[PDB]
Every structure is written in structure tokens, then in C-alpha cells.
Amino acid sequence: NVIQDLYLRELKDTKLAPSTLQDAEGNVKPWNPPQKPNLPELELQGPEALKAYTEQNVETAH
Amino acid sequence: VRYEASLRQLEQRQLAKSVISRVQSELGNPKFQEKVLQQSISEIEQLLSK
Amino acid sequence: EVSSILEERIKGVSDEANLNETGRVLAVGDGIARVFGLNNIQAEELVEFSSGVKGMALNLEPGQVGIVLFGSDRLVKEGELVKRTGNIVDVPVGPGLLGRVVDALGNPIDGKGPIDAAGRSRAQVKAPGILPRRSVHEPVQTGLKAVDALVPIGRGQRELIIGDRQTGKTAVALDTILNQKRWNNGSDESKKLYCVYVAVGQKRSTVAQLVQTLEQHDAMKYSIIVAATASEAAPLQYLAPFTAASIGEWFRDNGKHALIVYDDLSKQAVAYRQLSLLLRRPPGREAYPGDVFYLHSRLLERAAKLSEKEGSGSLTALPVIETQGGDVSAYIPTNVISITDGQIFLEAELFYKGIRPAINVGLSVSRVGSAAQVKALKQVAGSLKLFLAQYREVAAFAQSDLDASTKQTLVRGERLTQLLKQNQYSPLATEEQVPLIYAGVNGHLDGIELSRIGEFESSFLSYLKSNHNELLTEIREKGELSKELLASLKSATESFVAT
Amino acid sequence: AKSAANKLDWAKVISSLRITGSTATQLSSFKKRNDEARRQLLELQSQPTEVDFSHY
Amino acid sequence: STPITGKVTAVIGAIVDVHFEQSELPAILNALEIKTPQGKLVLEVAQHLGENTVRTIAMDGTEGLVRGEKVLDTGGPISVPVGRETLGRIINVIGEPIDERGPIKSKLRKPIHADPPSFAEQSTSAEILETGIKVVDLLAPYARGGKIGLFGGAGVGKTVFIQELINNIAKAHGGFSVFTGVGERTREGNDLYREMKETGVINLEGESKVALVFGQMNEPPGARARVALTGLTIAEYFRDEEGQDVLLFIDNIFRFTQAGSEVSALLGRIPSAVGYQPTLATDMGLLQERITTTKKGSVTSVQAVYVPADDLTDPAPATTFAHLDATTVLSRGISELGIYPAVDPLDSKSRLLDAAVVGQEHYDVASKVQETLQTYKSLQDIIAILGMDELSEQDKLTVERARKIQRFLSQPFAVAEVFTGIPGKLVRLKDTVASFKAVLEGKYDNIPEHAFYMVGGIEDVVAKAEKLAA
């Protein structure tokens, strides 16, 4: 009775309207996309490696 | 998704205070007189049904 | 809208009650509202507050009735109308509480819809009479070899489970339930034990794990979990075993059998203590109320194997008391120990020593014994009792120069002890309890190296299934070992032991 | 490939016996095992580029 | 503030009875503010004594309370403010900065009381937290969303243990942490505040991954009791609304019991066993129940507990012992042996340690460890009278492994650079299982005892052997 009156008027006459996308956005993680798989560069260039390895190797027994 | 769900819950609580606003409206209205009288006569009828 | 439906439910509440007795709180402090009115109140009436809180009325004093709130003070305040429901405490009892988790009120805390129950019956109702009670001719099997043989348990029998705090205290209880799945499947309703676990104290997270485990083992389909959790109020906790018992009466009265496990009654005691001190009721030994004994005795004697004129039915019980330091001398343990017919006492050293179950046979007793034991299992475990007794004594003579006799005892004893160890949540059938113990008794496996016992055991079971699952089924169905069965069984064991 | 790498590694323990004084065997072995296992756990860790649009 | 004005009637302690006028009813658990040069003295309404005369508990001091002093009623449970600037500031019981970083941003306020989530709501833990402390990991592995409980001695590195946890676990996980101090020293407060400013967990410009609520023991017992409830709601704000998992930390919950015990007595409610609250069980229970792994947020409490006179069978620790998922005992003896951590391994037991749960290998290794230690413990008595001189070669080897294991446990901590000056070690879960496995197998029975002493992982055990070898 009283329940009916309060509710009927309330539901019917007053309805919230959803907020801005920005307000939703603010309370949640925004998103920015990760970049790069990882591209490293060529290493152990030239005969530096060739000379180094040939000379360095003597890791044998005598 | 989390805030989307939260906004729905927040809405139920918003609508709760809107119900409270409507409670004040009822108590402002001569529903305060007329529905209290309705309750009075209803209670008489109920009490007569005892 | 969700709002519209919720209001629709509220809208349907507009009935007025011309309350024959109304009371009004004078003061509410400590959850002890002292209400003015309620002259027609019956003792332990259910009363409904303005807050809607429910209560009982332990103290009926002439001018004011000191109601005990089942609810919380947060929603209770002074001056409040205290409607008198006018009906002393009753809880639904009936068939459909199988696989249902309910709180004490009888509201589902699993929330799996309204309870299916046939009546709501009072829970302060008394225990079966002397003449309405006749002997326990029925055994019950928990799927634990040691428990079933060394401490054989029956139906309508109450036996304590007093032991070290949560060290698989819950695990021991659950094991019985798992073997009861097998028996439940079994048609005879003396074998359809509709189990009731009464989780007293245990928090909702802990019981959620129990629930999950129970669902996993599909045990819910005869289980009932009366749950009074840590958050749940001390009056609810107090009346929780009494309430649980009432559910059990329906089964017992129906002539069926069931098993109610009160776990742990120690926390029930604390709740009564809390209540009593707050009601200014006299404290007693170990600051527990004096008539805490009176409560426990009433509860534990309701459980019983009824007379055959009383439709041959029962409510088996297995109360669990948690001994905080193994203090059997403690007031609540001493009382319970007298009331109970048996004790199981798990020992911490054994737990630490990885014997899980950590059961200590010495301080475990059954006072009904072979009346509730399978004949087959009795035969092949009289020897076992004697052997283990010697092993215990000669375990302390394990410490340099030691006789061959002493060494034989040690070999047999260690191997037997290892044999009776069981991994948690593995139940077993009696028809496989009997072979393993027979082997150990005949010392076939006592010959086999200690390290190889485990592998032998599982292999032996598979070997038995292959060689003669006829023997196993025969053992199961005959239930009594003929000389021919013991011969044949020995042969099978010999054959297995050789491999 | 990867199976060649480990098979040759254990072979090299007994090859390095024939020519003891190894010190970059340990660097070769540690590096090949490490990155093989590291990439394997990286590849097992992987959620390929996926997002819900069915449910979420 | 409702025009319910009450005049004090009895100052007899923290208990202050107020005499609200006729025709104006208060409600239990309200908040009264009394204008004072002490700002607003906050009284939590805890009983009604009728005739509009309440019996309330004070938070702040009752010195200079004037008889018949007007008491405004602000009503309902005290509502603190919550926000994300809750993180990085110390907050007193009544919800005000103690680091004076201005008022906490009051996006929302919430009451300090809240009710445990229902049985239906609960979602059960089944994930393994890692501490990086080997003994803890093997012999009592912790589980995310758990209820870890640090029973231990008199700040016997109780704080240190927590500091290590914050250093490793808190920093590691992105979720918030809340460090709550119930009746703890301002000396300790200053050290912790300074220390956590240093570790950068507290960032005083920029958000902190921890929040602090320090309630200290100079505060009257009432304030000491109800600081915890406040802390729980902050965790709830995180748990629920922010959704974020909370690695809660509270200190020390025996102080929570003691604070409550005092006000039980003061409330006139007869105190139960060993003078504790009559409502000890349910108050602990409500606190513990509020803290849980919820679908909205998994909450992982680490609760310090002080074992009075190292007796844990005293009803207050023993009652708490039930509610805790993952108990841990930190004992003086093990510390004294020079083993850091001071954890008693046998007594430290976490619920999860089940064979499949931790994996069969982990379990089997841990079973072997448990046996090895238990055997050693049994043999200690034998060594006591007989001596190790007639107990097996096997027994001697088991003992030798146990001494090695005993000092394998000795693992330094980064937060015991303050103490010992020895930088800590973090050992991977897989690595710890492996390292214990090796020892038991006897692979490292050629490794010196002191080359296990105060080292981390397998590499370290070997390395310190190499150092000694040189």
C-alpha cells in the first residue's frame, strides 16, 4: 500500500541515467599496448671472433 | 568489466537514496493524512476481524 | 528490473499481527535484551524482534525476560517491540536435507533453494528409553583397516574421537563418509547411513573446503552439513548439536540408520560458557557452566540403536572433542569420556612421524567391540591386537645387544605398523581389509622387507583381484571365513608372497 | 636440433676428458642448456595474442 | 549529528556513561563526538542502559572530562575515509593521518564495522604463495589468499620476518598490502616507517604499494581494540571495490586479544579463561571471518601473534590457532643455535602440504626431511645418555645430514643486513626442492657443515664449499 505508493512513484518518476565513458575509464585500467618483441643487433663481428676463438682455444690437455 | 559491474551495484545504492527522497515526498504529501487515515480504517477493519 | 522484483516481494508483506504479547526492550547490552512484557511466554520460545532477530528466553524473571539474541546487536536497539512467535524452538526435519548444507535455523547456507523437509519438530526432545533401545548387532566400516578392526565401530553406537587439533581430525571423520558412499549405494537402509556432519566452530572457508571435497567425492547425496561457523552466533552454536540431532531422529524413527558427527563439541562448550557468563549464570570448572555436563549427556544419549519394536533403527554417533594439549583431564573431556562408549586418541608424535592417521592404539578403545565387528575381520585381527601390543613394548627395547626373539617382534611389528598406515582419503572395503591383515598376521609380509611393504600391498590387491576376485566377493558376501576360505586365502597369499 | 644439443653436451663431458682444461665447455654448455630451457618456459608461458570479445 | 545531546554522568575510566535526554533514542555502535580541546573525543556506543543513558567506550583519553559535558551524537559506526591515497600514509584509529600528509583523500568513507561475507560468497584458495624462505616453502608452503599466522617470540625478528616478506612478496605482487599495527611501539613504528620509505614501498610522492594504520600502545584500550576493524574495511575497499588482492599484514593480534580483555573487564562482563573476553571466541571469529579469499578479491593475511610466555596452549593463542590456515611458530632456540630463520620447522605447519597439492616429489622430499629431523630429534636423547658411539652408521649418516640440513636452513635475509650484515637469498621453488633432494640423497655429504651455514640455494652450498676448499 505504502510500499506500492513509494515504489511506484520512485521507479516510474526517477531513473538514473548512465555516466560518461570517461568516468568508467577513470576507475579502470585505461590500456596502452606493449611494444616490440625484442630485436637485438648482430654481435661478435668480423675476424675479432675468429682470431679470439682460435687463439683462446687451447683448453685441451698437454 | 569490474567497474561495469560495480556501476550496477552503485546504481542500486543510488536508487536506494532516490527511494529515501521519495519517502520524504510521501511524508510531505497529504498521503501523510489520507493514507494514514487509510491505515486507520484498515486497522479498524483488521481489528474488527479479530 | 532487479529493484522492481525485490519491491514486489516487500509489497506482499503488509499483514498485521495483533500481538497477544508484545514486549518492549528496556535495555539491550551484551546481546542480552531485557524485555518488559511477554507474560504468556513459554520457556525457550522463539521470539521475533522489531529488527526481526530471533531469540530464546533462558532467563524468565518475573518483571523482565532476558532474551538472548540469535542475531547481532548492530541491528538491535532499545525500546524495540519484541513480538512473541510463541513457538518453542523447532527446526525442519524430513527427507530432503540429504546433500544439503544448512545453518542451524535451517536456512541453506549453500543456498540451494528452500529445504525439503516433512515437518518442523522441536530440538529439545529427549533420548530413546531403555526399553526403546536394543543391542548393536550391526558393525559399520569406515574404510580404515585399523579403525574397523582394532576399534570396531557399530551403528547406534557413540564413541569419542578425542585428539590433537585439526591434525587430520576432520580427515578421520571424512574417511568414514567416503566408505559410506559404498554402503549408501547398498540398498539396505541399515547400510544407508544418511550422514550428518555438524561443523561447530569451523569457519566458512574451512567448511567450504569440506563442502568442495564432499562434492568432489559426490558424498553430498546423503550428507547433511549443519553448519555453525565462527561468524555464526553463540546461541546458534549452542543449540547446533541439539538441532542436528532432531534431523537424525527422523531417520532413526523411520527405522533407518545414520551417523552424526559432532565436530567439535569443545567449541560448543565455549559458546555455552560465553552465554552463561553473559547471562550471569554460574560459571563452573574450567570456567565452563556447571550444567554443561547435562547438555552433553542429553545430546549423546539421543544417539542409540533402538529396539526392534522401535522399528530397528538408529542414530550412530561419533563425537569429536578436540584436545588442545591432549588434556583428557580437562573438564569437558573427562565428562564426555564417561558418557561415550569408546574413545579414539590420536597422538602427535605419530603425526610428526608421518603416521597420518596418527591414531594411537593404546589410548584408542571400543567398549562394544566384537558385537559390532565383521566375523571374518574379527578372526584375522585377534592376533593383530596381541602382536601390536608386543610391538609397542618391544619398541622401547629397540634401543643394542638384543635377542633374536626381540628382533623377530621388531621385524613383525614394524612391518605391521607400516601396513596399517593409510594415505588420507583412501577408504577400503572389508573384503580387502581381511586379506591384507591375514597376510600380516601369518607373517608372510613380515618376512617381506619393510621398504617393499607398500608396493607389495597394492600389488597384492591387484593380484587378489586377478587370482580370485571370486574369493574377494565370497569374503564380502559370506562375511565369515570358512576353513576352506582361510586355506584358499593362505594359498593366494603364499603365491603372491613368492612373487 | 635441441636433441642434438644435449646429446653432444654429455658427449663433450667425456670428450673433455680426452682434452682436459675445459673452461669454455662450461660456457657453451651453460648457455645452450639455459637458453633452450628458457625459451621453452617462455614459449610455455605464452598467451598468444588473444582477447575475449565472445564473453567480455 | 542528531540533536541527541547527552551529558556525561560517570567518568570511571574509558567507560563513560552519557545521559541522552528523554524522547531521543540512541543505537548501539554509534559514534559520539564530544567537543573538547582534544578535538572530538570519540565514544563508541556499546550498551544501552535504558532511560536514554548509554554506556559507551572511549577511544581517546578521558582526562579533564567535565561532569555533565555535552555529547553530540554523530551516529552509526565511525566512518573513516578510504581512497587510494590511503596507501602511503599512517592512519590512526579514528581515521586521521599520523604522518601528517594531510587528510586521506575521501573519495568514499566506510564504517569500521563490516560483516563477514556469506558461505555462498566464499571462493576457496588453491594457489601457492612463495616466500623465498626455503624452510617455509618446503615444510609449510603458503598459499595465496591464505591466513598465514606468525606465532612467535618478543619481536624476535618477528618484525624482521615480516620485513623480509614485504621486501620479497609485497614488492613482487602488484596488489596492495596494508600494514596494520595493533598496540605496537613508536620506536618500532619509526623504524618500520623509515625502513619502508627506504625500500620505496612507501613512496611519499607517488603511490605506495602499502598503506599503514599504526595504532600504538599509549592509546587507551578501546582504541587499541577497534583499530583492527578499521583496517579490515580498508582491505575490503581494496578487495571488493578496487578488486585488487590484498597481502594484509597485521601486528600483533595477541595485543588485539589483550585490548579486548581489558574492555571486557571494564564493561563489567565477567572475563573467561586466563582473563580473556567472554566473547573472545566470537570476536576473534568475526575478525577472522571477515578476512577471506573472496571472488572480488583474494585476501592473504599474515597475522603476527605473540605467544605469551611462549605458551601457545594458553587459550588466546590456542583459539586463534584454529582460525589460521597456515600456522608458523618462530622459536628462540633455533635463533640461538644461530639459525636464521628462527622458525621451529616441526611446529610450523601450513594446511597445504598434501602430496598431490605440493607435488609428489616435493611431498616425498619433505616427508624424508621430516623423518630425518624427527629421527635426529629422537637420537638427540640417545646422544644425551648413550652418546653417538653405538648408534648405527646409517643413524650417524642421518644425523650428519640433519646437522647439514640444520645449517642449510640457516639462510640470511636482506633485512638482516641490519642485524647480521649478511645479504639474503631468494631461492626458486623448484631449486629448493632440488637442493633438499640432493642432501637427502647424500650427494652433498662431502660438503662442510659451515658450507651449508648461512647460505641460499644449491649453487651457494657448493660455492661456500669451494670457498672453504680454497
Curated annotation (Swiss-Prot), chain A:
Biological process terms from the Gene Ontology for this record are: cristae formation; mitochondrial proton-transporting ATP synthase complex assembly; proton motive force-driven ATP synthesis; proton transmembrane transport
Q: Where in the cell is it found?
A: Mitochondrion; Mitochondrion inner membrane
A cellular component term from Gene Ontology for this protein is: proton-transporting ATP synthase complex
Q: Explain the purpose of this protein.
A: Mitochondrial membrane ATP synthase (F(1)F(0) ATP synthase or Complex V) produces ATP from ADP in the presence of a proton gradient across the membrane which is generated by electron transport complexes of the respiratory chain. F-type ATPases consist of two structural domains, F(1) - containing the extramembraneous catalytic core and F(0) - containing the membrane proton channel, linked together by a central stalk and a peripheral stalk. During catalysis, ATP synthesis in the catalytic domain of F(1) is coupled via a rotary mechanism of the central stalk subunits to proton translocation.
* Keyword annotations from UniProtKB, A to Z: ATP synthesis, CF(0), Hydrogen ion transport, Ion transport, Membrane, Mitochondrion, Mitochondrion inner membrane, Transit peptide, Transport
The residues of the intact protein that this chain contains are 33 to 94 of 124
Organism name? Saccharomyces cerevisiae (strain ATCC 204508 / S288c)
Q: What is its main location?
A: mitochondrion
Cytoplasm among the record's keywords? no
Q: Which family does it belong to?
A: Belongs to the ATPase h subunit family.
UniProt-recorded name of the protein: ATP synthase subunit H, mitochondrial
Please tell me what else the database record remarks about this protein: Present with 6140 molecules/cell in log phase SD medium.
From Swiss-Prot, chain C:
Q: Which UniProt keywords apply?
A: ATP synthesis, ATP-binding, CF(1), Hydrogen ion transport, Ion transport, Membrane, Mitochondrion, Mitochondrion inner membrane, Nucleotide-binding, Phosphoprotein, Transit peptide, Transport
Task: Locate the coiled-coil region(s) and give their ranges.
Answer: none
Q: Name one GO biological process term.
A: proton motive force-driven ATP synthesis
Q: Tell me what effect the entry lists for T340I.
A: In ATP1-1; growth-defect
Q: Say which domain of life the source belongs to.
A: Eukaryota
Q: Name one Pfam family in it.
A: ATP-synt_ab_N
Q: Where in the cell is it found?
A: Mitochondrion inner membrane
- Where mainly found? mitochondrion
Q: Which InterPro entries does this entry report, sorted A to Z?
A: ATP_synth_asu-like_sf, ATP_synth_asu_C, ATP_synth_asu_C_sf, ATP_synth_F1_a_nt-bd_dom, ATP_synth_F1_asu, ATPase_a/bsu_AS, ATPase_F1/V1/A1_a/bsu_N, ATPase_F1/V1/A1_a/bsu_N_sf
Write out the GO cellular component annotations: cytosol; mitochondrial inner membrane; mitochondrial intermembrane space; mitochondrial nucleoid; mitochondrion; proton-transporting ATP synthase complex
**Binding residues for ATP, per the UniProt record?**
G163, D164, R165, Q166, T167, G168, K169, T170
GO MF entries: ADP binding; ATP binding; proton-transporting ATP synthase activity, rotational mechanism
Marked site, Required for activity, at: S364
CDD domains linked: ATP-synt_F1_alpha_C, ATP-synt_F1_alpha_N, F1-ATPase_alpha_CD
Tell me which residues bear Phosphoserine: S14, S135
Gene3D superfamilies, sorted: 2.40.30.20, ATP synthase alpha/beta chain, C-terminal domain, P-loop containing nucleotide triphosphate hydrolases
The entry's family comment says: Belongs to the ATPase alpha/beta chains family.
Extra notes?
Answer: Present with 41500 molecules/cell in log phase SD medium.
Question: Which NCBIfam families would you find in this protein's record?
Answer: atpA, PRK13343.1
Against PANTHER family, the record matches this protein to: ATP SYNTHASE SUBUNIT ALPHA, MITOCHONDRIAL
Record-given protein name: ATP synthase subunit alpha, mitochondrial
Q: Which organism is it from?
A: Saccharomyces cerevisiae (strain ATCC 204508 / S288c)
Originating gene: ATP1
Curated annotation (Swiss-Prot), chain D:
In which compartments does the protein localize? Mitochondrion; Mitochondrion inner membrane
Instruction: Give the domain of life.
Output: Eukaryota
Q: What else is known?
A: Present with 6820 molecules/cell in log phase SD medium.
- Write out the similarity annotation: Belongs to the ATPase d subunit family.
Function field:
Mitochondrial membrane ATP synthase (F(1)F(0) ATP synthase or Complex V) produces ATP from ADP in the presence of a proton gradient across the membrane which is generated by electron transport complexes of the respiratory chain. F-type ATPases consist of two structural domains, F(1) - containing the extramembraneous catalytic core, and F(0) - containing the membrane proton channel, linked together by a central stalk and a peripheral stalk. During catalysis, ATP synthesis in the catalytic domain of F(1) is coupled via a rotary mechanism of the central stalk subunits to proton translocation.
Quaternary structure, per UniProt, is: F-type ATPases have 2 components, CF(1) - the catalytic core - and CF(0) - the membrane proton channel. In yeast, the dimeric form of ATP synthase consists of 17 polypeptides: alpha, beta, gamma, delta, epsilon, 4 (B), 5 (OSCP), 6 (A), 8, 9 (C), d, E (Tim11), f, g, h, i/j and k.
Protein name as catalogued: ATP synthase subunit d, mitochondrial
User: Where does this protein come from, organism-wise?
Assistant: Saccharomyces cerevisiae (strain ATCC 204508 / S288c)
- Lineage, top ranks: Eukaryota, Fungi, Dikarya, Ascomycota, Saccharomycotina
Q: Which stretch of the intact protein is present?
A: 4 to 59 of 174
Curated annotation (Swiss-Prot), chain E:
Question: Where are the membrane-spanning stretches?
Answer: none
Cross-referenced Pfam families:
ATP-synt_ab, ATP-synt_ab_N, ATP-synt_VA_C
Instruction: List the EC numbers from the record.
Output: 7.1.2.2
GO BP: any one term: proton motive force-driven mitochondrial ATP synthesis
Modified residue Phosphothreonine is at which positions? T74, T199
- Sites binding ATP sit at G152, G153, A154, G155, V156, G157, K158, T159
Q: Keywords in alphabetical order, please.
A: ATP synthesis, ATP-binding, CF(1), Hydrogen ion transport, Ion transport, Membrane, Mitochondrion, Mitochondrion inner membrane, Nucleotide-binding, Phosphoprotein, Transit peptide, Translocase, Transport
Name a single GO cellular component: mitochondrion
Modified residue annotations for Phosphoserine? S335
Q: What Gene Ontology terms describe what this protein does at the molecular function level?
A: ATP binding; ATP hydrolysis activity; proton-transporting ATP synthase activity, rotational mechanism; proton-transporting ATPase activity, rotational mechanism
Which PROSITE patterns does this entry report, sorted A to Z?
A: ATPASE_ALPHA_BETA (PS00152)
Instruction: Give the main localization category.
Output: mitochondrion
Report the family membership. Answer: Belongs to the ATPase alpha/beta chains family.
**Quaternary structure and interacting proteins, as annotated:** F-type ATPases have 2 components, CF(1) - the catalytic core - and CF(0) - the membrane proton channel. CF(1) has five subunits: alpha(3), beta(3), gamma(1), delta(1), epsilon(1). CF(0) has three main subunits: a, b and c.
- Alphabetical list of PANTHER family matching this protein: ATP SYNTHASE, ATP SYNTHASE SUBUNIT BETA, MITOCHONDRIAL
Q: What is this protein called?
A: ATP synthase subunit beta, mitochondrial
Gene that this polypeptide is encoded by: ATP2
